[PDB]
Write a protein that binds this ligand. Structure first.
Ligand SMILES: CN[C@@H](C)C/C=C/c1cncc(Oc2ccccc2)c1
Ligand SMILES: CN[C@@H](C)C/C=C/c1cncc(Oc2ccccc2)c1
Ligand SMILES: CN[C@@H](C)C/C=C/c1cncc(Oc2ccccc2)c1
Ligand SMILES: CN[C@@H](C)C/C=C/c1cncc(Oc2ccccc2)c1
Lengths: 199, 208, 201, 211, 201
């Protein structure tokens, strides 16, 4: 079995293009609003960012490789999408191992846990209505012609939100948007995390 | 005796050469045993609900690919090597708020039965409300550790004891430990069909 | 299978393509432009201000040109900025190493032009005295090559005005003006100076 | 003359360029401390921050050469990544140690290696009494992380911490600094475990004659 | 052709460091840009400066006529040997602010000028007075004695022409002295450049 897996990895990409486009499914699990800094208007979130895509170049017949259906690999061994927060104020801090799971249908699952500081005015967090902040996520360099974005849900997963956080969540959504600018033909997709929260 | 030193060096260089794994799978699963030694609660931040711990995390597992016959290598029964030279499990704190900081050399002990012992010392900031730390009852917080990417079918996560080792806890810490346990749990996450085991550190502590 | 032939055509283009840097005999022009997104922090105890901006860099190399007809009508591609030469554009009065906020990926076009737009957070030398007033404070930071003179790298801009169309509307600081004039100082030394006037919102 | 020396060194390094010690091939590592500053004592977390230079010396037969075969070269400098180095560690640090000096060692023709990293360390210390005439006392143990005294035999040249470079205008005055060597034995196991413990007694410079 | 000549030069060119019988002279000088912060709770002061370093290697020499008149080039500092110049009383690792690129000239000389931010041991008592505070920090090789690295200055006057005019701290004087210490047992001398700065709020 080990030899079959090693042989699979040895047998097993310049990224997508207009002629070979890719869809990335994105979802957030929001774990904690750690800090809300009203002297700089930065808020700090901890979340898990679920990323999934599929490549034909990663497919294999399991019967040809000892009935292996999936395996774990360094995210450095594979191409990964350049999904970026568009209004961060510090480099994102990676909180989980940089490992992805590849399946024989060519699909890749990668779920980095991250701490993010982003631009957010927390005025109102000390009130019943709370504060509201938003941050857009998408590719930094690819348009909708190379990378399209999808979600499995428009509701952020709050099932792991820390119940004794300094801040409680009033709502958290991850709506996808496809923006067409008047100037260009390409669509520009994003997924926007919108969080309403209070002390 | 200078020659003897030369021969044991040669035998070790040859063993390491001969030995130097793709990770576990449903069909080649791995048991990883975890144990914690809590050394210090450094800081409790009630403005962000983050607590900072220093601990040693004992990890051990066994690989057939790391076994050897000592009689073929000058009766070498174990050796030390950089953790970079070997596969290591992706044991992760599930509720950290900053990347974990490693305090010790990343070096493992490999024994001729293929067992590996790796014990990194770490400083961890994790989600924890310290309300009550200034009382006789104290505060109580938990943090889960487990593989980030391997389900229970690939890595089986065990302990040797339900008790966190406090015998090296810093006696002049700002915080005294009232109790510390490390029980196992099996959890279904929304991403994935398969169950993931963890070891959950539960710590009750108060200002000294 | 068309998708598969485009992948192979791109792999072949990148192999075919993969420059010692400019010289006095082979000089390079780098176009710079700034998009200011946020004034995060102004520290009056140290006279350091913190900016987040996107720095657009463009240049063109003959060694990166290709014929699209020979590579499947491929007119451009994305590639890691480590695969290519990049200019050593530096803030001249930073007080902390610049922090990169965006993937280090450039777009190369068939005519040999390159576009690279790193988002950055920068602390730089700036006295915010007067930021708590209607007139606000004014600060400046120069950007340019660290090691090349004007003989090897000349700098251009496409505009004298900093792009504020993405400036954070609920920042602690509002922008009164932001300009990016080019300045020249045996060899000439060019820079692009970011001058910002700002005040507490 | 310079060129022949440079050639001879390139040839020596190529000729020369160890799996670490074992019970059958133990290594003596000599340790010493030069304490340069107590920077900060934090009574809200019981952490104290030190700057020191940690001298490490050991000797390998595999690094020996005859100076006569290499143009009389008797010493050279090399990246400490180019060689094995011992896994000497503070046993009660609270942050990763920060290395302040270049990671370069000096190798001598008898096979001896000298490596002296300057370091900033945060470690567990209750500074109670630092604002009094008697001062505070902290201690931090240094030793191998994974090797017993039967693999790494830890020694010192002196029990005295070198204070000759202690910063004269530090916020903290040093009352004493020792580096005594200790051995610990477990009934289970035949191996003895050595450490060198840095013990520092210090006070706020304004606490001396404080009234 | 110019590019081919440069790529040939660098391929022809691409040092184990000095020894007693192959000593190297390193010339050092400082451009002081800012005193950012003076922390009287820990007696640490934070400087931003540019550290000019120059040395010469016979193994980096070439004939400009054999290489198309090329007289110098830029190269990553990781491509060449560089001296281990270190502050002797830093309290945090130095932070590099500029690209790590050096200029190599056909005579074998190398010029390398890193911009750095340095926290060092310094009591700022008196900085709030007319007389100011005075602090000093030594710079030199960590691991080489004067038998291997001979340290020199071109001048003892610290370059203040780029000092930030709205710093929280004004410079009363800055001097870089070529200093050494010798232990009577032994022939080796241990040189340094002592940077002495007198400053005030
Ligand atoms: C214990 N970790 C949870 C808290 C969150 C993450 C799970 C995970 C992360 N990265 C890849 C991924 O991928 C898989 C693909 C196929 C089958 C199973 C998992 C799973
Ligand atoms: C959605 N993107 C923003 C938040 C800004 C950053 C854009 C960018 C950065 N680097 C290259 C570049 O290049 C492209 C060329 C053509 C089409 C799209 C982008 C684009
Ligand atoms: C534009 N940056 C300045 C404000 C400060 C630094 C200049 C510099 C840094 N590193 C090498 C060096 O070398 C060269 C040699 C000859 C001509 C030009 C520069 C120059
Ligand atoms: C000028 N440096 C002091 C402030 C501290 C460090 C010295 C040092 C560090 N690493 C090796 C060592 O080794 C050498 C052996 C012989 C002669 C010179 C040094 C010396």
């Amino acid at each position: 079995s080990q030899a079959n897996l090693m042989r699979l990895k040895s047998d097993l990409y310049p990224g997508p293009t207009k002629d070979d486009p890719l869809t990335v499914t994105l979802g957030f699990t929001l774990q904690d609003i750690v800090k809300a800094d009203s002297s700089t208007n930065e808020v700090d979130l901890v979340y898990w960012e679920q990323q999934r895509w599929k490549l034909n170049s990663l497919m294999w017949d399991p019967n040809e490789y000892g009935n292996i259906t999936d395996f774990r690999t360094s995210a450095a061994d594979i191409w990964t999408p350049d999904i970026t927060a568009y209004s961060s104020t510090r480099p994102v801090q990676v909180l989980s191992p940089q490992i992805a799971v590849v399946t024989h249908d060519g699909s890749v699952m990668f779920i980095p846990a991250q701490r993010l500081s982003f631009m957010c005015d927390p005025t109102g967090v000390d009130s019943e209505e709370g504060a509201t902040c938003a941050v857009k996520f998408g590719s930094w360099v690819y348009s909708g012609f190379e990378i399209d974005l999808k979600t499995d849900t428009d509701q952020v997963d709050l099932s792991s939100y820390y119940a004794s956080s300094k801040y409680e969540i009033l709502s958290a959504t991850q709506y996808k948007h496809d923006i067409k600018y008047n100037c260009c033909e390409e669509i520009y997709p994003d997924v926007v995390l919108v969080v309403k929260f209070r002390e």
